Design a protein around this ligand. Sequence first.
Ligand code: VO4
Length: 283
Amino acid sequence: MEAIPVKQFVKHIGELYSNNQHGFSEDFEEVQRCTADMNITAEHSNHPENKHKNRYINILAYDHSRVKLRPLPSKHSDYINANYVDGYNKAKAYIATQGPLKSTFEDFWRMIWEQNTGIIVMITNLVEKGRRKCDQYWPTENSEEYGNIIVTLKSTKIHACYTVRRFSIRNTKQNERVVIQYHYTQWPDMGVPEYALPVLTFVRRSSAARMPETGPVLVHCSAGVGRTGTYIVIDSMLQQIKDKSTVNVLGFLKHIRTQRNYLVQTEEQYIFIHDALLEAILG
Ligand code: VO4
């Protein structure tokens, strides 16, 4: 399970696709099993005091990698359903988290301040097929206050497949920071877009916007695992291709699966990762 030379990768994808995607099915099933002999604790996610702070009962934050909020002057005020996730050759390159609930808006923005995050990647719509996926944690216009964080919408650009919102935030304790949200608007929950190029462009533009030297890029959808994990793997493998001209989806995915449960939720999303890299390689 070593890295694959980029010049051999598209051929590799053809083989994985063949025979009703036998190879992809094997890879993904190996991913889903790779936790088998691993118990990973998530005591804080399961504590009664924190239950209401989880969007989904089955979607937890592993203790070892969870993002801690600085405690407030409650015993569990340190909890948010969020995990550090590695990037290419960089620990804690991302924070992967659920779509914030109204009850966690303050926690969410406090994390962003405390972690010095400058980029938010959002990969879900607020509502999909009439179903609630994420509450709107930013102001529709002008400014809104979440705890001691005041968020001000500065500009918006709406492209065909994603929207870029530029915010200014400040701590009432003032100190101000730019936060840019990259919001992909056409990616269904538990699904994949038909074409990978628009997501490839989205990943390239949102990744390039990362400022040195700043906090982890925050990535979320609704549960914060499926689309979120898919983004993280594509971004990370683009980096590896840039650095070493090799690709290691299977190995990198098995690794981050120890950092937050269920990253990359479906075989279809697993395949979509490969399609995006293929588009980059051939392009
Ligand atoms: O909102 V997700 O189901 O893509 O983790």
